[PDB]
A = this chain, B = another copy of it.
Amino acid sequence: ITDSLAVVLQRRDWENPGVTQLNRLAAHPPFASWRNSEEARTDRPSQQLRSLNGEWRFAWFPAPEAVPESWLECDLPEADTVVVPSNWQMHGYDAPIYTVNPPFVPTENPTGCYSLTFNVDESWLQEGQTRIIFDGVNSAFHLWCNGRWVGYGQDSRLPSEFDLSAFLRAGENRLAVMVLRWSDGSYLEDRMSGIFRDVSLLHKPTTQISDFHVATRFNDDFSRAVLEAEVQMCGELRDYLRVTVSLWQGETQVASGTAPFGGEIIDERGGYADRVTLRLNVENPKLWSAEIPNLYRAVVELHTADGTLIEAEACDVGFREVRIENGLLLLNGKPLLIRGVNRHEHHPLHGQVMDEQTMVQDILLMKQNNFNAVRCSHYPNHPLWYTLCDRYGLYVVDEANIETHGMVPMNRLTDDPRWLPAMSERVTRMVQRDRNHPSVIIWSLGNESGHGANHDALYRWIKSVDPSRPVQYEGGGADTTATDIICPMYARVDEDQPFPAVPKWSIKKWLSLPGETRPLILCEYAHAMGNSLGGFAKYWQAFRQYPRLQGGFVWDWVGLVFADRTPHPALTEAKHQQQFFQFRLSGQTIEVTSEYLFRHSDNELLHWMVALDGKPLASGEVPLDVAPQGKQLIELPELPQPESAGQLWLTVRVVQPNATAWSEAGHISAWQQWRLAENLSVTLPAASHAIPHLTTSEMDFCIELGNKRWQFNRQSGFLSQMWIGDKKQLLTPLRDQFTRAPLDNDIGVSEATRIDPNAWVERWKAAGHYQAEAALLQCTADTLADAVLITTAHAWQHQGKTLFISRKTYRIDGSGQMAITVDVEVASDTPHPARIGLNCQLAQVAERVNWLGLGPQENYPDRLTAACFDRWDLPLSDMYTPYVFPSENGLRCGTRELNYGPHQWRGDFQFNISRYSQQQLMETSHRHLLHAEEGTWLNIDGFHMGIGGDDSWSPSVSAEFQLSAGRYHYQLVWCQKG
């Protein structure tokens, strides 16, 4: 018959861009079909919305032409039971991976056959309309109900609704869903097939609310608002039908309106008889923002003239105005600063199935790290996400599910009018679904699809239908006519990237180009792959200095956190750079500037502390009373002035004494540190009575002092062994190190098969930095009046070229201390080294690492503003960052003192300490393959290269963070317990 798979799978609707759906209902805001208005007002669950999530029968087939006809009537015997909201590649049916003919898809199209057997009660079948809703099905699908074909759907990321009234019988019914892995829609979504979102049954009355959308208008000072609500009905029109729209603040009704159906005259033929526009006046409305997410409840009742209710719908309403004025994006008249992050829908252990608790955890983490905006990365999200962003407060950019980055002209589809219908569906249905949410402030036309005329047409469509929101689009150079905002991807603060026909100007230069008036917000910046986010403070200095630089979205929230939502160290950096209080020090006065636009600092307390080399001396706490965008002066008490040598540090932090909806009591939101005053140590070490004794064989230099011994290998010139009593302290000799295990930013997109030679790791490998051999040049050993002096000279050579020369002096005096001075010259023509330091493997393993230096968390020369100077004590495992792909990690900069076991190192250095060598980190592909080595590897660097982070496919370490000086000096004193 006509419902057999032979007839249905004959036109190949999945290989036709002109067919994106069959028998699919219109798009609309989410509906519950409440039959009592009190349940709609309180958002209570509706008896008319029945979830079909749960156990479904599933079968897998290599191609759609391999499914037996009997599947249409009876469930297959070998079918496996699954939970329907899921991806079938989480169950071992076909292999998904991360990674040609625009209309055609491969003939071997993996096919999932879902089926459900369910009861429909008689009341639903007696009257009204029953529909099935698929919140998301990846690629395309065909639907059968009790063996009769219903319809066809595409656009995985938006709901597909089908009228099931004529197909449902009494009692048991069977739904059969054939889901294809690829369709023509895959060319706009350029894996992970299946029914990955919720499946529901909705019952509406015969006459019903088919649509409704709300808008807010304000006077000049936002003290008066008009809420306009347009309501569309479908069904049989009657003269007694009424629509009431009521607005509620809590349990208090603030406005209400009622009217029959029939709108104003639109043109010569009249108006809409099935539509009604109600206008509600709200005096002094509580405005919605991310800082204070004030919400109202709008209840739309379709009833009769006498008063019996037919059906009720409801939504949350936020009174807020978004507009671009004089080149500035304003919310409620104030210029926004977007502290945004890009976020994909990725469950920690369920693929693309997003549940409520994961969303709440993510929102809490983002708000706790000073994010106020989120970008729906390249497709519309679960509808619950927008509700949660309304309720907690987060600016949302809603993005159409259009992504054609694989195209070689890259606008081949988006400049073709034959693809205009498919793109128009993906834009219009998203706008029709999500236009009522106050959190959604910007529409995005999609991601990386070039710039065609379809983009301009859809941009103009959105501007006509919804003028309340700006439209942004990155594509064709991030500044085309299809965007209201210049929205570059990974443009840099100061350095231009003049690519042909799509240059990435520096954002400062981009703002001032001839004729350019628009605000600039980066849709993607600060790529967080691996050990990254160097140079973030430069971006935020630019954001705060330039009015039309209004922020951006950091790429990949999850990423800034691990899959289990464990935070990356760079997240701390972001939290510090995006904090809402800026601090200035002048003498003994702290100026606190609030970066809040709307809220007073009513839950803010300023704690301060003064410390000398990590030892606290004075502290206090001052309540903050700062108006939005205002300033508060805090005069400090007379600060201590110690006579003891050391450097005075003043730390201030902002604490929230009370808990909020998103933070616990005592939450730290902002902080800042200053150097107050330094006293130089002029006290001399008391002269010792003993003198270290030197013994010289041809093999080694041996120095003895009490129970301590130092042995230098004369063949190699390096300190080879150390003895306390009779215990050897070293496993590997202390030797110069100029390389690091490459980071994701060092590697770039360089591949073993496809080498990119501009990458840092490629330049280091070609120069022979990893294969350079140390050759001893001079070695002298002398006894002074009160010490022993060892001097060595080493040259590193590769293929006849000297890359580095290291000259070192070792002074061992009568107190047991060993001072090491290192002077290194680097050839100007070799690539700048990743580091200049010393490396050794300590024989003993200790539980704790103590250090007077910067920050508790890993910090680097170009990512260290969020670290504070103090005395830190951590477990050894806390000194290693478990990046998925192993690399150099765990460095602590600005370190004056390091204590590990019985060993102390003093000076001015960076260090990392771990159980993994740089060699093992380089040669291990995944972090689970790492194995702890016998002792502790210590890397003490005098100098270290920046890590970059602007992007991960080109060098991004700024010149001020490269080791280009050519000559380098450092000193470190090594002593033991005594």
Contacts and interface: CB of A to CB of B under 8 A. Distances in A.
Interface in A736-778: none
A832 interface: no
Interface stretch (A62-70, A221-229, A543-551, A653-661): A543-551
State the copy count for this chain.
2
Contact of A508 (B327, B496, B512): B512
Interface string A547-589: 1100000000000000000000000000000000000000000
A511 interface: yes
Interface string A318-353: 000000001110000000000000000000000000
Contacts of A515: 326-327, 517
Contacts of A547: 512-514
A50 interface: no
Nearest to A511: B512
Contacts of A327: 514-515
Interface string A495-516: 0100000000010110111110
A512 B548 contact: yes
Nearest to A505: B545
Contacts of A545: 496, 506, 509
Interface in A928-948: none
Interface in A515-557: 515, 517, 545-548
A506 B515 CA distance: 20
Interface residues on A, range: 10 to 19
Contacts of A546: 509, 512
Interface string A26-65: 0000000000000000000000000000000000000000
Contact of A326 (B506, B512, B514): B514
Contacts of A508: 508-509, 512
Contacts of A514: 326-328, 547-548
A491 to B, nearest CB: 14
A513 B509 CA distance: 12
Contacts of A506: 545
A548 B516 CA distance: 11
Contacts of A496: 545
Nearest to A512: B511
Choose among A327, A496, A506, A512 the residue with the greatest number of B CB atoms under 10 Å from its CB.
Answer: A512
Interface in A577-609: none
Contacts of A511: 511-512
Nearest to A519: B514
Contacts of A512: 508, 511-512, 546-548
Interface in A792-822: none
Nearest to A506: B545
A545 B512 CA distance: 11
Nearest to A547: B514
A508 B514 CA distance: 13
Contacts of A517: 515, 517
Nearest to A510: B512
A521 to B, nearest CB: 14
A545 B492 CA distance: 14
A453 B517 CA distance: 29
A506 B514 CA distance: 18
Contacts of A509: 508, 545-546
Nearest to A516: B512
A540 to B, nearest CB: 15
A546 B506 CA distance: 10
Choose among A327, A508, A547 the residue with the greatest number of B CB atoms under 10 Å from its CB.
Answer: A508
Nearest to A549: B512
Interface string A639-658: 00000000000000000000
Contacts of A326: 514-515
A515 to B, nearest CB: 5
Nearest to A545: B509
A515 B547 CA distance: 11
Nearest to A548: B512
A512 B496 CA distance: 17
Interface in A863-893: none
Contacts of A513: 547-548
Nearest to A326: B514
A462 B546 CA distance: 34
A484 to B, nearest CB: 15
23 contacts: A326-B514, A326-B515, A327-B514, A327-B515, A328-B514, A496-B545, A506-B545, A508-B508, A508-B509, A509-B545, A509-B546, A511-B511, A511-B512, A512-B512, A512-B546, A512-B547, A512-B548, A513-B547, A513-B548, A514-B547, A514-B548, A515-B517, A517-B517
Given A326-B515, A509-B546, A512-B547, 16 more contacts: A326-B514, A327-B515, A328-B514, A496-B545, A506-B545, A508-B509, A509-B545, A511-B511, A511-B512, A512-B512, A512-B546, A512-B548, A514-B547, A514-B548, A515-B517, A517-B517
Would you list the 4 A-B pairs with minimal beta carbon distance, nearest first? A511-B512, A512-B512, A326-B514, A327-B514
Interface of A: 326-328, 496, 506, 508-509, 511-515, 517, 545-548
